[PDB]
Amino acid sequence: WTPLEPKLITRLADTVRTKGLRSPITMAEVEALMSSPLLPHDVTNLMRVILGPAPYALWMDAWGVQLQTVIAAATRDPRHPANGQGRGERTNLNRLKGLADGMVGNPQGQAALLRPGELVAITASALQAFREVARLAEPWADIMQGPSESFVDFANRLIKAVEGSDLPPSARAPVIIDCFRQKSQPDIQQLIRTAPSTLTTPGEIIKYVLDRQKTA
Amino acid sequence: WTPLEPKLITRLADTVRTKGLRSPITMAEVEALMSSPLLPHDVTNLMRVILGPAPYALWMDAWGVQLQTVIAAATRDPRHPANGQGRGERTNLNRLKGLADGMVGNPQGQAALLRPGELVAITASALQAFREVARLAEPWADIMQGPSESFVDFANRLIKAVEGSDLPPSARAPVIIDCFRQKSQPDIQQLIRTAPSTLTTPGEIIKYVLDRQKTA
Amino acid sequence: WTPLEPKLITRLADTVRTKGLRSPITMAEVEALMSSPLLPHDVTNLMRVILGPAPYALWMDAWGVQLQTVIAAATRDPRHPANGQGRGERTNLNRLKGLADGMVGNPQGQAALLRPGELVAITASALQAFREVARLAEPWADIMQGPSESFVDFANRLIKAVEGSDLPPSARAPVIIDCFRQKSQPDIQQLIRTAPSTLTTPGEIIKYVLDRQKTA
Amino acid sequence: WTPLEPKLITRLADTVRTKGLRSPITMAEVEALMSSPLLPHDVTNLMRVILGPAPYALWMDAWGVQLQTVIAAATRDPRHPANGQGRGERTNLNRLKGLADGMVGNPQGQAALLRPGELVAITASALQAFREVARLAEPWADIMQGPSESFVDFANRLIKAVEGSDLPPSARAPVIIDCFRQKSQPDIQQLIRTAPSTLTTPGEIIKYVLDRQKTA
Amino acid sequence: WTPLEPKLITRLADTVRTKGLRSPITMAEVEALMSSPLLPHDVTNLMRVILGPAPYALWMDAWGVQLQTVIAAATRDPRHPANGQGRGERTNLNRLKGLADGMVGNPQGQAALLRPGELVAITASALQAFREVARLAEPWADIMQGPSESFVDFANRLIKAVEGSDLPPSARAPVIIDCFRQKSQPDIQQLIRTAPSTLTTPGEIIKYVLDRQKTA
Amino acid sequence: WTPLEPKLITRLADTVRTKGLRSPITMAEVEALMSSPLLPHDVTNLMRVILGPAPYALWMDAWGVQLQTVIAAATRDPRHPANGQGRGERTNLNRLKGLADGMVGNPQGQAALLRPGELVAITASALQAFREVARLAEPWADIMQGPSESFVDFANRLIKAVEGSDLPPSARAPVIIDCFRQKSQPDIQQLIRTAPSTLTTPGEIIKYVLDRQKTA
């Protein structure tokens, strides 16, 4: 086990302190420090340092919930990269949260007994939990394209607010499309309306509008 | 599998944030971080971090299209460095996009089953897709030299707009020359017209005009 | 013997100077510079540089007390990794504090005669002493949510004061919950009281209150 | 022999230029760059660069005096880590100051003939000389605890001024205690007076006061 | 082949952006990044990134002209470090500009087939071309030594303006001498006039004046 | 042949630009970058980059003179580490300045044919030439302590002007002492005169005066 640099952690903590939890630069920095698969000890201490007390409590809750969803999917499929073929390799939440025997407080033993699939699952779970808490701590139907705003900025803002909301995953694309059509001030509205082809995806709509947009 | 440094990724993300997607320094930095053959996981997370939501959607589209062209060329030639000799090594798009069995979400298994030819093909495809999206996201025949503008500023603006346009590479120099001759208000027009030597390159025209220009 | 970098020591000293002795980032940095087993000379000079005069006196006291507890456990078990099997390898406090013969002021001789078990015991003792002094140097039942204060600030302040106090670790969550319920002015008190679900964690209470709070 | 980085030396010189010679950050930085045992050449050039001309003269004087005290202790004990067992290894001041044969101006030969005990003795002597000159270049009985000042700051200031003064080493602890008792405004005066135990050490007094102090 | 760091290239580009092309600090930085022999790909991309469009066109022109002079000298001497002994190693401009077979667009193959003499000749040619373009993008006979200016600054400015001008190489030293004698306000004029020795070189004049100058 | 880092060269150039040629930190940095034996190409380009035009001319002159002295000593002793035993290894100035056959402009061939003794002799010659030019490019007996000036400032100024002058090294301390005694306005003059001890060192005089000075 090799610890993360306290210099990088200090820089990330100051980034979270000045920019906040939800800025795209902060999420990019977290993705950067979330590159190599981390042990539960690493992620736990990282969130202890970069997050305040109340966001840290929220993040512990969300991380537990996401890990429980992962363990449900694992008991729903014996071919999980964290699982094994026999029943003796089934992964309990004590092993994921670092609470199992031979792991409590010891990162070396942790790194010894853990699987790489276990590590990547823990890491993805922690990233999703961080996203949830960031969206929770500090409205997509109120988003309009400003008179002077470009279209890529409007699309970025709208997709961000729609994907970071309470909608089901299967309802985001139709909502994004129908918001492109009704928001996005009447020049682009008419540009999308008079589309000789049928656009059935936000990416296709974005490409079409970027091609035929009024250069100004 | 070894992940890319989040420090390099953060620096590249800030480069894309300040300079944009199309600057030659940004493309050089991307080529730098595109040096070793990356696994689909690496490139996917890299584009997730450095690109905004809408450019990321566009890039996913373009990457899929380029990979499909690659797979068409692969079924058109059984000697692809990603293919094998027998039919059992034919490479499906699920294996290229990282969607095949034993690869979904697991970078270690990905690195296990993938071929080096597969990796370099994926990498070249991703680079071409990035170029397409950069050219797509953010008029040379409307550029005139202002009455008060200097000539080097006009030349910079014109060369920028001509090279960052939809012209073929072999048509930029003649267009730049003929735009120097017809734009560039009539004092410099007559200065270029009465050139005892024949100027056959934008650099030579710029040098001549800078030598014989009316100091004012 | 190889000395620690004065650059790392200077950075750690400035960290202690700005963040204080008790911040989790400071303890993480100390754990980082406490990774390899240090000789008494190293830890002594490190604490001389990073700590002020009075905290250094306190730390010398605490380190002596912890080393004495270690030596009592060592005379209570002849199988200490610092001890040997015969009586001639029993470790005296002069050998632990670096005061024994051939060690006073000489780090090379120190590194020569010392055991790895001796080094790790000295290191753990010094870490525990640092924790004690940090807890000692610089009231949770008096914390109320102000009439104009938001709830996340109140939760941050309360969790800080409860975790940085003299309570056992197993008594912090119930106290934080019961302080959320009785402090946190009667609007939020009634909001928590009328919870159709049972909230059994500070994170869950924080999430619920943030969801259903009166936007104002 | 490997030279110290001129970048670190430049940073240390600017630190000495802005903060002064006596600041605790400056002494910490000097301790940092005084980590590995330096050859007389290294310390001499370091003090030549970081110190002005007059402080450098003072430091040469003080270094000579401290080295002479070291050589007196060495002739008073044939078991010095710089000495040897026979009389042929006795260390002369020409060998300590780098003036001996085969060493004058040559750092490689210096590093060849010098002992590690010689190096650490030279280094400790130079550090003590730096402390003396810093205390000399730019009053403990005039120190009072301000009405708003905390007790650890007052203790730090008092111990600093008492240890960096002209008192004998055997008279510092009683003076520090009796200054804690008579300074340290009457609340802490009465707190120390009504001590059911007898406090016979500055560390014990500091611990007691920090325990029973009026939180405010 | 190893690429240059995009961090160094970004710093150099910002240096060129703020200080300009002709500042001595910029030329020093270019000399720094021109230390190891670069392949045509490296220098071409470097000038593409650090220079604007019009200076880049000018630089391509000047680089071609200087490489043509080099190839003329090469056909004038079969002992060029880029040439070989037989006629089959004669170096064509397609091989120098990176246009030869097996080199177009491929830096690895470039580094494979190129000679070290080829690399150093290309590098020196590119440096001279950069100097020409910098002197061209933004008068010696108008330079006077100011009443308060020192003599070394005046000599630096004069030698810079004379060597970066349109004079033949064999006419710079006499002009520099005769400008030292007639400029360089009458105190130094009389100091040079009453020289018991005959000064026949700018360096000798500078040395003499620096020796006998009026300290003030 | 491996080139020096342009980053180190840029840092050294900025050091020379801010601190000057004669500062002890600058000479230390030059000694640092003069550690490994450099080829004539390396030293020539280094001095071209870090020095201005006129100091570079002066340095070329001084380097030639010092190399000529070296070659005179070499013809005065056939056992020079640059020479050989037979007459066919005698080293000409064309081989030292890098002007010999197979070396002009080619650092690789240079490194091939040159001897290590040749390299170290060239390096020492270049260092001595740099020292000469630095002493030449930029009065102690006119220094008085101003009526309002402190004594440490006067001592700094005097020691600076005496050590940076044309006196032999063995004549600086007596001159500094006798200038302390006769300058340093009559209050300090009488303070030094009535010294019950004999002060035989500038540091001792400075310490005595700082102790017994009239606080004002």
Author numbering:
A (entry chain E), B (entry chain F), C (entry chain D), D (entry chain C), E (entry chain A), F (entry chain B): 11 to 148, 152 to 229
Pull verbatim passages from the article behind this deposition.
As the virus buds from the cell, the viral protease cleaves Gag into several fragments, including the capsid protein (CA) that then assembles into the mature capsid shell (core), rendering the virus particle infectious. The CA portion of all retroviral Gag proteins folds into two separate domains, the N-terminal domain (CANTD) and C-terminal domain (CACTD). In mature lattices, CANTD interactions form only intra-hexamer and intra-pentamer interfaces, while CACTD interactions are also involved in formation of inter-hexamer and inter-pentamer interfaces. Our results show that, like lentiviruses, RSV is sensitive to IP6 in vitro and in cells, where in the mature CA lattice IP6 binds in a pore formed in the center of the CANTD hexamer.
Further analysis of the different hexamers forming the mature CA lattice in polyhedral CLPs revealed that despite the deformability of the CA hexamer, local symmetries exist in the lattice. This observation was further confirmed via the structure determination of a small set of T = 3 icosahedral particles solved by single-particle cryo-EM.
